[PDB]
Amino acid sequence: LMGGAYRCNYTRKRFRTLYHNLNHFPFPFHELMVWAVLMKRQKMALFFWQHGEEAMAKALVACKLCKAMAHEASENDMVDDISQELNHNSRDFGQLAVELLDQSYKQDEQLAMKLLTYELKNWSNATCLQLAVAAKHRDFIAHTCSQMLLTDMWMGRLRMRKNSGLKVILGILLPPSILSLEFKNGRKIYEFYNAPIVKFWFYTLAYIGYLMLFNYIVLVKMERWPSTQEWIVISYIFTLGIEKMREILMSEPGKLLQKVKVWLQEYWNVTDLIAILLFSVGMILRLQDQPFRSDGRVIYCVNIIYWYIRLLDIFGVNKYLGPYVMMIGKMMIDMMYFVIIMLVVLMSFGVARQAILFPNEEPSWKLAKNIFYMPYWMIYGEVFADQIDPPCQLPPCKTGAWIVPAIMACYLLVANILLVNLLIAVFNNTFFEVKSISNQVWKFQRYQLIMTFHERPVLPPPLIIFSHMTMIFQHVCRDYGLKLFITDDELKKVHDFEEQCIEEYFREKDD
Amino acid sequence: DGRVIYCVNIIYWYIRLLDIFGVNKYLGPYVMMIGKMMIDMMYFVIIMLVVLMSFGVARQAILFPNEEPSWKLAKNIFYMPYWMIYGEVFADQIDPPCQLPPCKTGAWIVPAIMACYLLVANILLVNLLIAVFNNTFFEVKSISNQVWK
Numbered sequence: 011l012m013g014g015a016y017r018c019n020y021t022r023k024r025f026r027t028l029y030h031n032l033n034h035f036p037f038p039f040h041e042l043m044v045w046a047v048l049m050k051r052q053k054m055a056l057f058f059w060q061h062g063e064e065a066m067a068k069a070l071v072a073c074k075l076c077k078a079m080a081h082e083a084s085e086n087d088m089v090d091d092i093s094q095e096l097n098h099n100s101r102d103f104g105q106l107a108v109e110l111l112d113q114s115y116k117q118d119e120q121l122a123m124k125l126l127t128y129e130l131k132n133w134s135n136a137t138c139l140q141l142a143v144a145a146k147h148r149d150f151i152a153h154t155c156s157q158m159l160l161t162d163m164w165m166g167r168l169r170m171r172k173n174s175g176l177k178v179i180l181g182i183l184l185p186p187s188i189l190s191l192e193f194k195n196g197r198k199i200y201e202f203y204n205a206p207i208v209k210f211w212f213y214t215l216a217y218i219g220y221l222m223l224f225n226y227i228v229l230v231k232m233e234r235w236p237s238t239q240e241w242i243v244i245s246y247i248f249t250l251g252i253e254k255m256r257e258i259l260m261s262e263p264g265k266l267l268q269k270v271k272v273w274l275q276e277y278w279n280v281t282d283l284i285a286i287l288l289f290s291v292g293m294i295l296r297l298q299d300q301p302f303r304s305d306g307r308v309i310y311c312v313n314i315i316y317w318y319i320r321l322l323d324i325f326g327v328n329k330y331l332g333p334y335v336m337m338i339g340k341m342m343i344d345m346m347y348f349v350i351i352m353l354v355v356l357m358s359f360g361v362a363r364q365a366i367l368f369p370n371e372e373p374s375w376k377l378a379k380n381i382f383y384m385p386y387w388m389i390y391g392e393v394f395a396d397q398i399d400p401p402c403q404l405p406p407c408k409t410g411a412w413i414v415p416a417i418m419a420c421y422l423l424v425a426n427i428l429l430v431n432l433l434i435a436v437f438n439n440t441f442f443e444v445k446s447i448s449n450q451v452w453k454f455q456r457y458q459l460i461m462t463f464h465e466r467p468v469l470p471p472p473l474i475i476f477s478h479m480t481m482i483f484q485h486v487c488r489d490y491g492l493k494l495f496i497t498d499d500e501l502k503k504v505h506d507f508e509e510q511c512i513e514e515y516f517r518e519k520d521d
Numbered sequence: 522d523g524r525v526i527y528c529v530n531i532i533y534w535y536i537r538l539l540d541i542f543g544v545n546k547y548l549g550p551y552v553m554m555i556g557k558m559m560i561d562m563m564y565f566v567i568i569m570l571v572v573l574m575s576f577g578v579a580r581q582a583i584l585f586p587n588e589e590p591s592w593k594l595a596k597n598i599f600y601m602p603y604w605m606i607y608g609e610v611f612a613d614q615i616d617p618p619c620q621l622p623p624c625k626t627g628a629w630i631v632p633a634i635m636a637c638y639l640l641v642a643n644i645l646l647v648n649l650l651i652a653v654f655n656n657t658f659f660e661v662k663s664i665s666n667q668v669w670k
């Protein structure tokens with residue numbers, strides 16, 4: 011029910027050995043809570059939740075279990091009453107976890123941050139953040155305490171918080187400037203270059219350089235044999251493909267065919283694969299005779315558009331430039347239907363005009379071009395009334411050519427005054443929902459961004475081939491970032507703080 | 522050179538009349554609202570510029586494949602794709618109808634990229650900017666009124 015990474019306490023070899031010759035339980039309310047959750051007893055589970063230690067972890071685990079049971083019951087096509095009664099339990103447990111987190115952060119902040127990161131021995135060594143992410147709980151990760159914890163994990167071991175970013179670029183470009191930044195309590199360089207923010211900025215600078223080289227090679231004349239910049243671009247593409255293959259192989263599932271399915275879940279990955287294959291085909295066709303070389307160059311020119319577009323993924327790290335991109339992504343789906351309707355009207359007008367003006371044309375594929383070309387250009391400003399309805403020294407006028415200006419006028423009135431204004435109204439009246447949803451989704455995906463830049467080779471793709479050599483040499487041979495290991499006294503203090511917080515929460519709610 | 526600097530200065534001194542206008546009861550808050558919508562517009566200009574640069578580079582590389590390196594290349598990318606979105610969409614200056622020099626290899630992609638670029642720039646981003654201006658106007662209006670008073 012939990013997931014691939016989870017490992018229950020009963021299935022461990024120690025408990026199998028203990029159970030074979032058949033004691034007690036150190037935390038009985040954990041077992042009773044899981045029993046009540048698994049047997050669809052909501053009141054009993056809510057009673058057992060407020061007793062014992064680790065209330066927030068219990069709430070998140072119960073939420074995940076209820077969601078998984080609801081999904082499985084819906085899949086197994088049982089009575090839909092159960093599959094709708096379980097989702098309510100999941101929502102209730104998620105709300106309890108969110109309220110407990112809010113109370114804990116309201117009381118004390120350092121203990122609240124320590125609560126979300128410390129390793130949980132009873133729940134297969136997973137922190138509260140990982141349990142919340144595995145449960146797809148957006149309201150928990152989007153909370154203020156979770157966002158500040160994510161910012162602390164993203165900044166690395168550097169204490170600069172006023173105006174960052176510029177200093178990171180300075181340190182990347184000027185290594186002597188590194189030994190002037192404050193650090194959290196020789197080895198300073200290793201801690202600087204392993205922070206995820208520095209990795210991200212190094213990757214961004216490498217991508218900017220690669221884009222510049224690609225623009226240079228496509229703009230300037232191309233010869234029989236590739237120049238140096240073309241070789242650099244080809245090496246960048248090859249190493250990026252190798253890095254994508256490495257990301258595929260070291261994924262979460264243990265099956266080679268199954269990891270591909272999980273990797274093909276984000277659209278950026280499949281678009282990257284398509285672009286890399288297209289670039290490989292174009293490069294293969296490029297090193298040939300003149301016509302195939304021209305075809306390869308045209309493939310290069312077409313392919314550069316995608317690498318220009320992919321800068322939005324880089325922009326997505328910004329606080330204000332990410333939600334706008336998600337809003338654009340939703341507005342495209344909102345715009346498709348009006349594109350269809352305008353296409354219908356445009357085709358009608360174009361066919362009518364072409365049939366009226368030119369009545370003695372032999373069948374040719376040029377006819378399919380004259381329908382879409384000029385009616386489409388006529389709605390973006392080029393409404394030249396000399397080309398359409400020609401003034402017919404004087405060639406004879408075509409029969410019925412006085413209808414073309416009237417049809418054009420009606421078509422312009424429909425297309426430029428009605429549909430576009432209705433589209434403006436549609437965009438305007440459905441903006442608040444899209445804005446809130448995009449903000450929540452970006453705040454949730456910040457965690458995945460931080461994780462995927464924390465687990466990444468330090469060198470950018472154009473010279474990442476060297477960092478792939480060390481993974482082969484080390485083949486024959488987490489202090490922080492994910493978890494936080496604490497002693498027994500600190501664990502007891504955290505448990506005391508959590509019990510105080512949950513008691514205060516219940517008392518305040520009753521009052 | 523001094524005359525050109527005079528022209529730039531007359532641009533600035535013409536702009537500086539909004540400070541004089543700022544004494545009016547209704548012409549001050551509008552200027553402050555302009556000041557904040559400037560930030561929003563500058564946030565959208567980056568995306569518009571990315572799309573524009575992509576289309577310009579693609580068209581320039583497709584149509585002219587035998588150009589020596591010159592700074593004129595950096596001009597042909599920004600000039601015409603920018604003038605296109607302000608109503609000057611042409612069909613003979615760009616995508617030439619190729620008595621006739623031979624057609625360039627792959628010149629049938631320029632009108633399709635042009636159509637997609639116009640659809641993205643003139644129907645999507647500008648309408649989204651209109652929605653952004655419209656849905657965040659009451660807060661800006663109240664704050665500007667308070668700050669002016």
Ligand SMILES: CCCCCCCC(=O)OC[C@H](COP(=O)(O)O[C@@H]1[C@H](O)[C@H](O)[C@@H](OP(=O)(O)O)[C@H](OP(=O)(O)O)[C@H]1O)OC(=O)CCCCCCC
Binds near residue numbers: 174175324325326329
């Ligand atoms: C070529 C770039 C293309 C990739 C662009 C990659 C995308 C990109 O642009 O980076 C975003 C990042 C901005 O975020 P950054 O951390 O630097 O600064 C934030 C900003 O100062 C806000 O004003 C702060 O408060 P608030 O929010 O107002 O309340 C916020 O504080 P907090 O809330 O965090 O505590 C700060 O985080 O960097 C820059 O743009 C600075 C110049 C660097 C870029 C200029 C140098 C090129």
Ligand SMILES: COCC(CCO[C@H]1CC[C@@]2(C)C(=CC[C@H]3[C@@H]4C[C@@H]5O[C@]6(CC[C@@H](C)CO6)[C@@H](C)[C@@H]5[C@@]4(C)CC[C@@H]32)C1)COC
Binds near residue numbers: 225593
């Ligand atoms: C008259 O002959 C000129 C000659 C000197 C020729 O040198 C050339 C060197 C390459 C260079 C600087 C030149 C023209 C286009 C320039 C491109 C414009 C691109 O714009 C950018 C624009 C913005 C970027 C995001 C994308 O690329 C560059 C990758 C690109 C760019 C700056 C690469 C550099 C190119 C001039 C004189 O010598 C005596």
Ligand SMILES: COCC(CCO[C@H]1CC[C@@]2(C)C(=CC[C@H]3[C@@H]4C[C@@H]5O[C@]6(CC[C@@H](C)CO6)[C@@H](C)[C@@H]5[C@@]4(C)CC[C@@H]32)C1)COC
Binds near residue numbers: 373375376377378
């Ligand atoms: C140079 O000479 C060409 C010659 C071959 C000529 O064959 C012709 C056969 C009819 C055909 C395929 C041709 C041109 C217009 C084509 C129309 C375009 C229309 O578009 C569609 C567009 C979308 C639809 C919704 C509406 O109609 C078709 C009804 C229509 C359509 C596909 C019908 C088919 C027409 C070519 C070469 O032979 C050696």
Ligand code: NA
Binds near residue numbers: 390
């Ligand atoms: Na116009």
Ligand code: NA
Binds near residue numbers: 391609
């Ligand atoms: Na015009």
